[PDB]
C-alpha cells in the first residue's frame, strides 16, 4: 500500500512542527526567568535603609520597626524567612520590601537589667536616670545552648554566658530590643 | 520497500520521545516561572501600618492611634464590628482602614499606679522621674472576672488580679494606655 | 365672537408649557440639593484627624491646633459654630475642614495649679519639674453655674466645684489647655 | 356657547395659581441651593497658617517664624507695611504671605528675667530648670510710655510697667520672644 | 574706468547690511542680559528660609546648615563669596540656593566657656546642666584687631574684647556655633 | 568725476570703523552673557547632602548615616573603593550616591571614656548627665602608629596618642562614632 507512507510522512511533519515551536517556548521561558531573577537582585540595590525585625509571620511577612513605626512588610524571594532571628537588623529598598538580614545593632544605649520576666523573652532593664522599661531579648541572649555561667572567682572571663541580674545590656528603647552582653568593671 | 518503513518508524519513535522529554521539562519551567511570578506580584501591593486602639464608636468607626497621631477611621467588612477590646494593637492598610486585631503592646515604659480613677476607666500613674499622667486602662486590666487578690500572707503574685494601687504596670504615655501588670519583687 | 376663544386656548397652552418646565426645574433643584447635602456627609467620612480648638471666629473659621501648629480653618455646613467651646477636641478630614465637635481630651499631663489669672481664663499651672507654664482653661472649669466650693470637712466629695489653688489639672502643654479637675489623695 | 367660557376661565384661573405656588417654592429652592453652594465653595480655598513676627525690614519683607522655622516672606498689599509691632502673632496664607496682625501669644513658658540687655531689645532670662536663654522682647514690654514703677511700699502690681529684673515674664524659647509680664504673688 | 565705482557701491551695501544686522544682535544680547539679571533678583524673592553658614568653598559653594542637616549649596551670582564669614546667617529660596548674607543669630542658648582650643577656632563651651560641647567660633570673637582685654578694675565696660575663660556665650548647639559675648553679672 | 571717489572712500572708511567698534562691543556682550549664563545654569543642578561613614563593605557599598537615619548606598566609580576610614564625614548627591571623603566632624558632644571595648572597635563612654552609650571609634583614634603615650610625670598631652581610659573624647551619639580626642586640663 501507498497510503501508510503518506500517513507517516505527515505525522513526522506534524511532530517536527511541534518540536520547532516547543524548543522555542522553552527559550522564551528560560529567558523570562533569567529576567525575573535578574529583577530580584535589582531590588536589593542601593540606596537602602535599615530597620529592626520585630516578629516573623507565616505568609512571608515581617513586623519590622523602621523610621519609627511598627510596619508589616513583604520581603524578597532571595530571603530565607525561617532563618530570620527576632530582633535582627534587616535592610530595605525604596518601597519597603526587605532584602537582606544582618548583624545586630552594635552601638547605643547601655542599661543594666533588673530581672528576666516570666515570659523568658522580656527583661526589666533599668536605664540611666533610674528609668525602667521592658524590652524584647534578642534571640542570642536566651539562646538554647548557653553555658551555665559558672561562679565569679576565676576573675574576668567575659566569654558568652546566660543572662545575669547584674549585667549591662546594649538596647534600643526606640524599638524594643536587647542585643548583647557587656563587660563593665564599676 | 521495507527498509523505508523502518527508517520512518525509527525517526518517529525517536522524535515522540524527544517530544516527551521537552513536554516534561517545559512543564517544570512554567511551574517555577509561575511560583516566582506570584512572589514578585505580591511585592507590588503596599505594606501595612500598625496602631493602638483607642475607643469603639456606635458608628462603624474607631479612634486608633497610628503614625504618631490620634485618628478616627473605618473598619473593613470582615472584622468584628465592636468585639475588639479598648487598647489593643491593630493593623492598618495603605488607605488607613483597620483589618485585624492583635496582641497587647508588650514592651515600653513602667510606671507605678497612683490610684484608679473616678470612673473606673482612666488611671493616674507616676512615670520615671516623678511626673504624673493619666492614662486609659486597657480591657484586660479591668475585665469582669479578676480575683480580688487576697492580702499577701502567702508569697507569689504572678497570676491575673484587680489592680491594687502600687502596682507597676506598663504604659505608652504617647498614646494613652496601660497594657498589663508586672510581677514586682523587692 | 370667535377670536376670544382662540385667545384663551392659546394662553392655556402658554401656561401649560410654563407648568411642564417649572415642575421639572424643581426636580432638578431638589435632586441637586440631595446631592450637595449627600456631599457634606462625604466630608465627615473617615480617615480623619483630630485637633484642639483654640478660638472661634465670626466668619465660620476656627483656630484649631492640630499636628503642632495654630491653624485657621474652615468648617462644614453640618456644624453648629456657636455650640463650639474653647478647647474642645474637634475632628477633621483630609484637607483640613472641621467635621464634628467632641468630648474633652481625657488623658495626659497632670499638673497642679498655682493661681488663676486676672484674665479669669488663664492659669499658672506648675508641672512636674517645678516647671511653670500658662494654659487657657477649658470653658468647663470657669463655667458660670459652678457650685462655689464649700470647705473640706465632710471629707472627699470630688463632685464638680469652682477651681481652687490646690487641685491637679489635666493639661495639654503642647496646645495650651486645661481640661478637667482631678481628685488626687496626697 | 357660554359654558365653554366658564370651563376655560376656570382652567386658567386654576393653573395660574398652581403656576404661582410653584413660582414661589422654586424661589425658595434656589435660595437654599445657592446659600449652601457658597458654604461648600468656601471649603475649597486652602486654610491658614500662623507664626510670630520677628522683625520689620526697610524692605517690604518680614522675618516671621512659622511652621517651626525662621522664614522671611512678603506682605499683602492690604496690611500696614511698618505699623505691626515686634513679635506679635500674624496669619499666613497657603503660599505663605502675611495677611493680618493679631494678639500676643498668651500662653507658654514662664521664666524669670535676669537682666535686660546691652541694647534694650534682648533679655537674658532663666527658664524652668536653670538654662539661660536670650530672647527678644516684644514691643509692649519696652513701649515708650510705661510708668517708671514706684518702689513697692503699697501692694498690687497688676498695672503696666518697665521691666524690673526679677519679674517673671512669659516666653516662647523656640521662637525667641517674650510677650507679656506676669503679676507675681508670694 | 566704470568697474571700480560699481565695486565700491557694492562693498558699501555689503557693509551697510552687516551694520543693520549687528546693531540688532546687540539689542538682542542687551535685552537678553537685562532678562537674565532680572531673573537673578527673582531668585532672591520671598518666601525664603534661613540657614547658618558652616564653611565656604572655592567653587562658589557653601556648607550651610539649614533645617537640621549639613548642606553643600550653590549660591547666586548676586553674592560675594569672599565676604562670607564662618557662621553667618544666610538666606535661601525655595530650592536651596543662597541669596543674601546677614547679621548673626541674636537669640538663644547661653553657656559659659571653659577654654579655647589649640585650633584657635573651637571652644569648650559648657551649657546648663554641666554639659560640655564643642562649637566653632564666629569669626568676630577671635577677630584680628580685638583689643587685648585689659584687667578688670575700672569696673564693667562690656565694650568688645578678646575672649576669656569666664564669659558667657550665645551659641547654637544644633549648628555648632558661638556668635557673641555677653555681659552677665552673678 | 573725482569727488565721487572721495565721497565713497569716505563713507567706506567711516562705516568699516563703526563696523569695528560694534564688532568689539558685541564681543564684550557675548563674553558677559555667556559667563553669566553658566553661573545660572549651575543653580539648576540640585545641592548636596552630607553624612557620617559607618562601615566599608566587601561589596561596593557603604553604610553611612545621613538625613538622620542609617542607610547603605553605592559609590561613584571615582572615589577610593575602600581606602576611606571608618566614620569620616562624606558628601552625597541628590540620588544619594557618595562622592568624596572629608574631614572629621569636629564639633559636638564631649564624653569621658570609660573603657575601650572587647574587640578594640567600640568604646563605652559616659555622656553629659550620667548615661552610658557604646560608640564606634573612628580610624584616627585607633590607627596603627600611635605612641604608647608614656606616664604623666612631665606635662603637655596635646600630641597624638593611644586612648587611655579617662580621656575626654568628642562624639555624635545619634550616629555612633567618636571622632577625636581632647586635651584635658584641671
Coordinates of N, CA, C and O in Angstrom, one line a residue, chain D residues 57 61 63 69-74 95-96 114-115 117-118 122 124 129-136 175-177, chain E residues 44 46-50 67 89 91 100 104-111 128 168 170 180-186:
Chain D
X57 N 11.5 94.8 58.1 CA 12.6 95.2 57.2 C 12.3 96.4 56.4 O 11.1 96.6 55.9
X61 N 9.5 93.3 53.4 CA 9.5 91.9 53.9 C 9.5 91.8 55.4 O 9.9 92.7 56.1
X63 N 10.5 89.0 58.7 CA 11.1 87.8 59.3 C 10.1 87.3 60.3 O 10.1 87.8 61.4
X69 N 10.2 76.9 61.7 CA 11.4 77.6 61.3 C 11.3 79.1 61.2 O 10.3 79.7 61.6
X70 N 12.4 79.7 60.7 CA 12.5 81.2 60.7 C 12.5 81.6 59.3 O 13.5 81.7 58.7
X71 N 11.4 82.0 58.8 CA 11.4 82.4 57.4 C 11.0 83.9 57.2 O 10.4 84.6 58.0
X72 N 11.5 84.4 56.0 CA 11.4 85.8 55.6 C 10.5 85.8 54.4 O 10.8 85.2 53.4
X73 N 9.4 86.5 54.4 CA 8.3 86.5 53.4 C 7.5 87.8 53.3 O 7.5 88.6 54.3
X74 N 6.9 88.0 52.2 CA 6.2 89.2 51.8 C 4.9 89.5 52.4 O 4.2 88.5 52.7
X95 N 0.5 80.2 50.3 CA 1.8 80.4 49.7 C 2.6 81.2 50.6 O 3.6 81.8 50.2
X96 N 2.2 81.3 51.9 CA 3.0 82.0 52.9 C 3.2 83.4 52.5 O 4.2 83.8 51.8
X114 N 16.6 88.0 84.0 CA 17.8 88.0 84.7 C 18.3 89.5 84.7 O 18.6 90.1 85.7
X115 N 18.4 90.0 83.5 CA 18.7 91.5 83.3 C 18.5 91.8 81.9 O 18.8 91.0 81.0
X117 N 19.0 93.8 78.3 CA 20.2 93.6 77.7 C 20.9 94.9 77.1 O 20.2 95.9 76.8
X118 N 22.2 94.9 77.1 CA 23.0 95.9 76.4 C 22.1 96.9 75.7 O 21.9 98.0 76.2
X122 N 17.0 92.7 73.7 CA 17.1 91.4 74.1 C 17.1 91.3 75.6 O 17.6 92.2 76.3
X124 N 18.1 88.6 78.9 CA 18.6 87.3 79.3 C 17.7 86.8 80.4 O 17.7 87.4 81.4
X129 N 14.3 74.9 84.4 CA 15.5 74.4 85.1 C 16.5 75.4 84.5 O 16.3 76.0 83.5
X130 N 17.6 75.4 85.2 CA 18.4 76.6 85.2 C 18.9 77.2 83.9 O 19.7 78.1 83.9
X131 N 18.5 76.8 82.7 CA 19.1 77.2 81.5 C 18.8 78.7 81.1 O 17.7 79.1 81.2
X132 N 19.8 79.4 80.7 CA 19.7 80.8 80.5 C 19.7 81.0 79.0 O 20.6 80.7 78.3
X133 N 18.6 81.6 78.5 CA 18.5 81.9 77.0 C 18.2 83.4 76.9 O 17.9 84.1 77.9
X134 N 18.4 83.8 75.7 CA 18.4 85.3 75.4 C 17.5 85.6 74.4 O 17.6 85.3 73.2
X135 N 16.4 86.4 74.7 CA 15.2 86.4 74.0 C 15.0 87.8 73.5 O 15.5 88.6 74.1
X136 N 14.4 88.0 72.4 CA 13.9 89.3 72.0 C 12.7 89.6 72.9 O 12.0 88.7 73.3
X175 N 11.2 80.5 69.5 CA 11.0 81.5 68.5 C 11.8 82.7 68.9 O 12.3 83.4 68.1
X176 N 11.8 83.0 70.2 CA 12.8 83.8 70.7 C 12.2 85.0 71.4 O 13.0 85.9 71.8
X177 N 10.9 85.1 71.5 CA 10.4 86.3 72.1 C 9.9 86.1 73.5 O 9.8 85.0 74.0
Chain E
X44 N 16.0 86.0 44.6 CA 16.1 86.5 46.0 C 14.7 86.9 46.5 O 14.6 87.6 47.4
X46 N 11.0 86.5 48.3 CA 10.3 85.8 49.3 C 9.3 84.8 48.7 O 8.8 85.0 47.6
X47 N 8.9 83.7 49.4 CA 9.2 83.3 50.8 C 10.6 82.6 50.9 O 10.9 81.9 50.0
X48 N 11.4 82.9 51.9 CA 12.7 82.3 52.0 C 13.2 82.0 53.3 O 12.8 82.6 54.3
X49 N 14.0 81.0 53.3 CA 14.4 80.3 54.6 C 15.8 80.7 54.9 O 16.6 81.2 54.1
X50 N 16.2 80.3 56.1 CA 17.4 80.9 56.8 C 18.3 79.8 57.4 O 18.0 79.0 58.4
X67 N 17.6 73.6 58.5 CA 16.7 72.5 58.6 C 17.5 71.3 59.0 O 17.4 70.2 58.4
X89 N 24.5 84.1 59.3 CA 23.2 83.7 58.9 C 23.0 84.1 57.5 O 23.3 85.2 57.1
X91 N 20.4 83.6 53.8 CA 19.0 83.4 53.3 C 18.9 82.4 52.2 O 19.9 82.2 51.4
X100 N 21.4 85.9 50.1 CA 21.9 87.2 50.9 C 22.9 86.7 51.9 O 23.2 85.5 52.0
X104 N 24.3 88.1 62.6 CA 24.5 86.9 63.3 C 23.2 86.5 64.1 O 22.4 87.4 64.4
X105 N 23.1 85.2 64.4 CA 22.0 84.9 65.2 C 22.1 85.7 66.5 O 23.2 86.0 67.0
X106 N 21.0 86.0 67.1 CA 21.0 87.0 68.2 C 20.4 86.5 69.4 O 20.5 87.1 70.5
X107 N 19.7 85.4 69.4 CA 18.9 84.9 70.5 C 19.2 83.5 70.6 O 19.5 82.8 69.6
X108 N 19.1 83.0 71.8 CA 19.3 81.5 72.0 C 20.0 81.1 73.3 O 19.9 81.7 74.3
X109 N 20.8 80.0 73.1 CA 21.3 79.3 74.3 C 22.6 80.1 74.8 O 23.5 80.5 74.0
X110 N 22.6 80.5 76.1 CA 23.8 80.9 76.8 C 24.5 79.7 77.4 O 23.9 78.8 78.0
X111 N 25.8 79.7 77.2 CA 26.7 78.9 78.0 C 28.0 79.6 78.3 O 28.5 80.4 77.5
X128 N 24.1 74.3 80.3 CA 23.4 74.5 81.5 C 23.6 73.3 82.6 O 24.4 73.6 83.6
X168 N 30.2 84.5 79.2 CA 29.1 83.8 78.7 C 28.8 84.0 77.2 O 28.9 85.1 76.8
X170 N 26.6 83.2 73.5 CA 25.5 82.9 72.8 C 25.8 81.8 71.7 O 26.7 82.1 70.9
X180 N 28.6 85.5 69.9 CA 28.8 86.8 70.6 C 29.0 86.7 72.1 O 28.7 85.7 72.7
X181 N 29.6 87.7 72.6 CA 30.0 87.8 74.0 C 28.7 88.3 74.8 O 27.9 88.9 74.2
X182 N 28.6 88.0 76.1 CA 27.6 88.6 76.8 C 28.1 89.0 78.2 O 28.7 88.2 78.9
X183 N 27.8 90.3 78.6 CA 28.0 90.8 80.0 C 27.0 90.2 81.0 O 26.0 90.9 81.3
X184 N 27.1 89.0 81.6 CA 26.4 88.6 82.8 C 27.0 89.2 84.1 O 28.2 89.5 84.0
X185 N 26.3 89.5 85.1 CA 26.9 89.9 86.4 C 26.4 89.2 87.7 O 25.6 89.7 88.4
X186 N 27.0 88.0 88.0 CA 26.4 87.0 89.0 C 26.9 87.0 90.5 O 26.8 86.1 91.3

